[PDB]
Design an enzyme around this catalytic site. Sequence first.
Site, mmCIF file in Angstrom:
data_model
loop_
_atom_site.group_PDB
_atom_site.id
_atom_site.type_symbol
_atom_site.label_atom_id
_atom_site.label_comp_id
_atom_site.label_asym_id
_atom_site.label_seq_id
_atom_site.Cartn_x
_atom_site.Cartn_y
_atom_site.Cartn_z
ATOM 1 N N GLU A 1 46.134 33.947 46.966
ATOM 2 C CA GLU A 1 46.464 34.973 47.928
ATOM 3 C C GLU A 1 47.216 34.441 49.285
ATOM 4 O O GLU A 1 47.633 33.375 49.152
ATOM 5 C CB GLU A 1 45.015 35.602 48.699
ATOM 6 N N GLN A 10 49.318 35.556 53.360
ATOM 7 C CA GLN A 10 49.440 36.533 54.380
ATOM 8 C C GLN A 10 49.805 37.846 54.057
ATOM 9 O O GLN A 10 50.039 38.920 54.658
ATOM 10 C CB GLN A 10 50.301 35.991 55.553
ATOM 11 N N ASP A 59 65.198 32.206 48.398
ATOM 12 C CA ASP A 59 63.999 31.678 48.410
ATOM 13 C C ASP A 59 63.957 30.562 47.429
ATOM 14 O O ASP A 59 62.731 30.458 46.922
ATOM 15 C CB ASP A 59 62.981 32.589 48.579
HETATM 16 C C1 X1W Z 1 55.314 36.913 39.725
HETATM 17 C C2 X1W Z 1 54.209 36.511 40.226
HETATM 18 C C3 X1W Z 1 53.333 37.754 40.875
HETATM 19 C C4 X1W Z 1 53.115 35.677 39.293
HETATM 20 C C5 X1W Z 1 53.256 35.715 37.584
HETATM 21 N N1 X1W Z 1 52.317 34.852 37.254
HETATM 22 N N2 X1W Z 1 51.716 34.177 38.497
HETATM 23 C C6 X1W Z 1 50.965 33.323 38.331
HETATM 24 N N3 X1W Z 1 50.229 32.790 37.234
HETATM 25 C C7 X1W Z 1 49.194 31.600 37.525
HETATM 26 C C8 X1W Z 1 49.649 30.283 37.834
HETATM 27 C C9 X1W Z 1 48.978 29.155 38.029
HETATM 28 C C10 X1W Z 1 49.394 27.706 38.417
HETATM 29 C C11 X1W Z 1 50.620 27.965 38.617
HETATM 30 C C12 X1W Z 1 51.812 28.774 38.475
HETATM 31 C C13 X1W Z 1 51.310 30.059 38.129
HETATM 32 C C14 X1W Z 1 50.214 32.935 39.796
HETATM 33 C C15 X1W Z 1 50.848 33.349 40.754
HETATM 34 N N4 X1W Z 1 50.374 33.081 42.140
HETATM 35 C C16 X1W Z 1 49.470 31.626 42.452
HETATM 36 C C17 X1W Z 1 50.125 30.138 41.731
HETATM 37 N N5 X1W Z 1 50.271 29.092 43.062
HETATM 38 C C18 X1W Z 1 49.491 29.681 44.084
HETATM 39 C C19 X1W Z 1 49.566 31.135 43.897
HETATM 40 O O1 X1W Z 1 50.641 31.430 44.625
HETATM 41 C C20 X1W Z 1 50.840 31.882 46.041
HETATM 42 C C21 X1W Z 1 50.687 33.479 46.146
HETATM 43 C C22 X1W Z 1 49.476 34.415 45.853
HETATM 44 C C23 X1W Z 1 49.264 35.557 46.202
HETATM 45 C C24 X1W Z 1 50.365 36.479 46.520
HETATM 46 C C25 X1W Z 1 51.687 35.743 46.918
HETATM 47 C C26 X1W Z 1 51.936 34.506 46.655
HETATM 48 N N6 X1W Z 1 51.919 33.914 40.682
HETATM 49 C C27 X1W Z 1 52.130 34.582 39.489
#
Ligand code: X1W
EC number: 2.7.11.22
Lengths: 286, 279, 65
Positions: free
Chosen positions: A11, A13, A113
């Site tokens: 999650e 901002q 980015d």
């Molecule tokens: C295309 C996008 C939507 C996507 C697809 N798969 N996936 C995953 N898979 C699991 C995973 C686990 C470990 C490492 C990488 C991936 C995770 C993830 N986010 C999280 C991973 N690190 C912290 C958080 O990210 C900040 C964050 C949160 C909420 C909203 C915006 C940014 N995003 C994605």
Amino acid sequence: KRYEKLDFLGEGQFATVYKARIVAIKKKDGINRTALREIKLLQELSHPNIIGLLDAFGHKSNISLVFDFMETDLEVIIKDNSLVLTPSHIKAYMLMTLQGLEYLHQHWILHRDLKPNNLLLDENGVLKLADFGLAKSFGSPNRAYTHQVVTRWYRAPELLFGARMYGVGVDMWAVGCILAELLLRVPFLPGDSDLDQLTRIFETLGTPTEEQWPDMCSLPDYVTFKSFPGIPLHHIFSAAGDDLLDLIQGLFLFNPCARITATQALKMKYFSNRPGPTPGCQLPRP
Amino acid sequence: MYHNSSQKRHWTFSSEEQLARLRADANRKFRCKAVANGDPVFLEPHEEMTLCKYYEKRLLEFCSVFKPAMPRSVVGTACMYFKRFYLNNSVMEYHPRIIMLTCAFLACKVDEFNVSSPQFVGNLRESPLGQEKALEQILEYELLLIQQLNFHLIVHNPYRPFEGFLIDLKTRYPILENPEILRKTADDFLNRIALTDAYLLYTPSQIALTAILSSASRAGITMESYLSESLMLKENRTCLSQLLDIMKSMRNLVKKYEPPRSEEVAVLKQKLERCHSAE
Amino acid sequence: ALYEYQPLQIETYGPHVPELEMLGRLGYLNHVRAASPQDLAGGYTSSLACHRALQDAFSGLFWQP
Ligand SMILES: CC(C)c1cnn2c(NCc3ccccc3)cc(N[C@H]3CNC[C@H]3OCc3ccccc3)nc12
């Protein structure tokens, strides 16, 4: 809906991400402009090294975006002390990133980015560029951008000098910083501020001159720095080969026009020489 | 790019008959749901077309006086949104006024023309209470519009293809000494084309080329050599014939266009108001 | 194993677009606005705008729905 929520992933901002049955769902001004940007850009793009927007939904002014589930990212790979990054693994990650970037630039889109945590890896060792919330189309003269894009540690010097108009050079400089992070396992240029980021850039690579950057003084936020000599590239990257050092120099050229594009980077001898890129099924899983 | 875009894959249609089928389907569905939720008040598909044309002109008028200046790409995107939305939706369910305002709103967001909600609604010639109500309606219909557009937001307009064709004419067609004399009339014909359904039937490059060549023909200039020689279509007779037939069909669509009549628009406006006041 | 570059095979359904680096020596850039020193410092050249305009002019010109 058609998605049963499985697990919490993160999650911030901006939004929250959940693993759901396997996909990842990211949930007076109306619909969020970042979500609209991501939707409108990822619908027009299809490439194995670009994250795929499978579906979108929501209610009221809220909206959710459905993506392929991604197992890890390059930030986790770099930060993992157990993982040994062989030259083959570095070449594989670099190749996938550059192929995705070449496809993206060919369709006149700048990611803006690029960073290790925006390069996601799946179970099959396939790297995809993600987080298109700052991505924008380029090539239109009548379109002013902002210089406050790209994370500061990966921001290009032209951006740090206030460049309103730029090209693929911002993404290529971020790509060079990512390659340096892959080689050194630490951020290449960790500037605590824009001025300190410029200072570290000029202290590692030397202060650009008129011959290295013909119009650098014309940028609105150009600031004169000390005449740093810079560290030799092979000193910084002691294990790097000659082809890899040529690639690094091409990625870190101060002149944005002279900076190597994704196509030129892919055509460099580094990606053709032995050993070849490690196949996806053999990439290290953290 | 257009050649692998969602506009080409999903929103370029084979024929006017397919569009008519889609619109008749929308009208019939609304009629069936209306008689299953409770009559000459029902609008015929051609009346829906007259209303949609009138409100597309209203959308053009709204975008032309918009402050700050509205980029032409935003206006084209908004008009394309309007056409796409009313391909599959009846004006009897969603009022074209709110839908056209929502189209402009979403086009501003998509094209990256940064405008805040208060300054967007300040362009409406209504009271601040009316502006607030219109803003609330737009915010309520924004997601509906996005869903009906099938989350296909990038719209390829013929303006930049027009610019590219003018560059190509300046570079490789010295026979046309000043291509700039084919800009005003070509853009007038481009607007006339935009009035029709051609944006749902032909590629933006084809529309731009048709406008330029119609401008040339109006000027007494025959650039058939530009297609045959510069575009190398003399090496492919079938491709040249197909392109020429596409332009001829576009010109036929333009000449057969019928503007809505003011009295007919008024009568259909009363009918539409009665339809929305019911159910 | 060993990688070899291959250009992206994407069908444009239209006339071939001259290469970007080629535009200047074919006279295209004589009909586009010149990039300002600020733009060139930022890495923006008139060749980019010209190439984009030409690609959009030629994209899908021969396509039929
Ligand atoms: C295309 C996008 C939507 C996507 C697809 N798969 N996936 C995953 N898979 C699991 C995973 C686990 C470990 C490492 C990488 C991936 C995770 C993830 N986010 C999280 C991973 N690190 C912290 C958080 O990210 C900040 C964050 C949160 C909420 C909203 C915006 C940014 N995003 C994605």
